[PDB]
Amino acid sequence: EDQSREQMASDVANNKSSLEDGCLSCGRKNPVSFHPLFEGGLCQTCRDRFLELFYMYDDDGYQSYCTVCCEGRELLLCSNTSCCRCFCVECLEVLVGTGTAAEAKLQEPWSCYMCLPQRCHGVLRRRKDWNVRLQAFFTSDTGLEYEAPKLYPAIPAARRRPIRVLSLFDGIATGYLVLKELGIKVGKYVASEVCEESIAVGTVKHEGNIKYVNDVRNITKKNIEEWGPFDLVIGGSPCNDLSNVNPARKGLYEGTGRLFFEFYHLLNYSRPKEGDDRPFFWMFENVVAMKVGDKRDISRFLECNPVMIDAIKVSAAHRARYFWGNLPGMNRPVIASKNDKLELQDCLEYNRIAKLKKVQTITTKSLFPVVMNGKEDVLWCTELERIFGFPVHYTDVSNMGRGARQKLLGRSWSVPVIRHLFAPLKDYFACE
């Protein structure tokens, strides 16, 4: 019963059946979900395997596999600027028409069907609302629908107190950086960054206002009561454990992925006891490109469904991630601000021209992003900081170079994204 796609394509081309009933690339009947790009259905296995590898990218700056099904065997890349979309050789001729595979390979330059104005090439009719329809896929599709978060009661303006933060895997102190950018008065902050390179950043730049502690491995229960009531628990675990960029690909239950459980343990301890009514919150952040099996696990352990704020809508780089938590308003409409840097041309030094408008994701490892005086060059550390919204020269401490000033900026959060997330907290704690 493993029917192929040619029969379905022939049936729909004669107005005998619909595209929804069939898996858009698997060909199997009994669809479970749609395709955000093309009109049709997607099978359970296809949906499971394409939730994961959509947002992964290669070093050269193009998608790692097909934009249609899930797979890369022979790929023909679109050469249009500000577009890296790649297609599948098998996908083209079986749905749009015979002979298009060799014809496309000869025309220079090649433009993908998304670039050109929409035309129903065979059965590949693009959506006119795919821009607003892709978001609904990732936001909420899983089986269980957890209850809506409780809305804490309002507090009078004169009955507000300074917040007592407790950060984990603090990195270069991004939360502390945004907290005074909003205006909230921080009465206490307890980071637990163990990297001595990053520790020097927090002490010098914030004047020893971070009561630094060691790894989040030896903090005992009595410690979390010796330090008093905590009104916020930040945390972002390292994401170099389970990603399909490294072959090992150890799960969340092995290797460096067990640091998530430390956040849960500390959240249990810092949580107010039963019968207490102080405002309490939490948060999390991890790479979206994680296994589906563990994507639900983090949701179930924390009993919340992740959101997806897409950095492109606010910054000049592509990196989306999951933000669990019970913040009051973590599902609104993303809006940019006046003091933003939407295009890369605003994140460059003097006498340099930006060839692109947006830049592919940046990782620990570092072609034609900028040309000065008719000569190509690569981005500076002074330029990698304006992209994320960090103040310039932030990492210029402890005798650094390109070797380390790029690793720290690679696995850090985004100033505009968190600035968006922590906006509602101006009502429960001290302002000005």
Ligand X SMILES: Nc1ncnc2c1ncn2[C@@H]1O[C@H](CSCC[C@H](N)C(=O)O)[C@@H](O)[C@H]1O
Q: Which residues are part of the catalytic machinery?
A: 239
Check whether the bond before 306 is cis (ω within 30° of 0): no
- Report the nearest approach of ligand X to the CB of residue 215 (Å): 4
Q: Which stretch binds Zn ion (CB under 5 A): 72-80, 152-160, 178-186, 282-290?
A: 72-80
| 26, interface contact from a copy of itself, ligand X, Zn ion, none, CB < 5-8 Å by kind | Zn ion
Neighbour-count burial of 408, counting CB atoms closer than 10 A to its CB (0-12 exposed, 13-18 middle, 19+ buried)? buried
SS3 readout for 393-419: CCCCCCCCCHHHHCHHHHCCCCHHHHH
Q: How far, CA to CA in Å, does 9 sit from each of 96, 98, 114, 123, 330?
A: 9, 12, 21, 7, 42
Residue 411 assigned as binding residue: yes
- Report the nearest approach of a copy of itself to the CB of residue 423 (Å): 29
- Report the nearest approach of Zn ion to the CB of residue 379 (Å): 24
Residue 309: strand pairing partners: 321
- Phi, psi (rounded to 5 degrees) for 317: -155, 160
Q: Which stretch binds a copy of itself (CB under 8 A): 7-15, 108-116, 235-243, 392-400?
A: 392-400
Per-residue x/- track, 14-53, Zn ion (CB under 5 A): ---------x--x---------------xx-xxx------
Q: Where on the chain is the footprint of ligand X (CB under 6 A)?
A: 169-172, 174, 192-195, 198, 215-217, 236, 238, 411-413
Residue 378 binds a copy of itself (CB under 8 A): yes
Residue 170 assigned as binding residue: yes
Residue 165: strand pairing partners: 232
Q: Per the structure block, which two tokens stand in for 222?
A: 């009595």
| 117, interface contact from a copy of itself, ligand X, Zn ion, none, CB < 5-8 Å by kind | none
- Report the nearest approach of Zn ion to the CB of residue 116 (Å): 8
Q: Which stretch binds a copy of itself (CB under 8 A): 47-55, 90-98, 255-263, 319-327?
A: 255-263
Binding-site residues for S-adenosyl-L-methionine, please?
170-174, 193, 215-217, 411-413
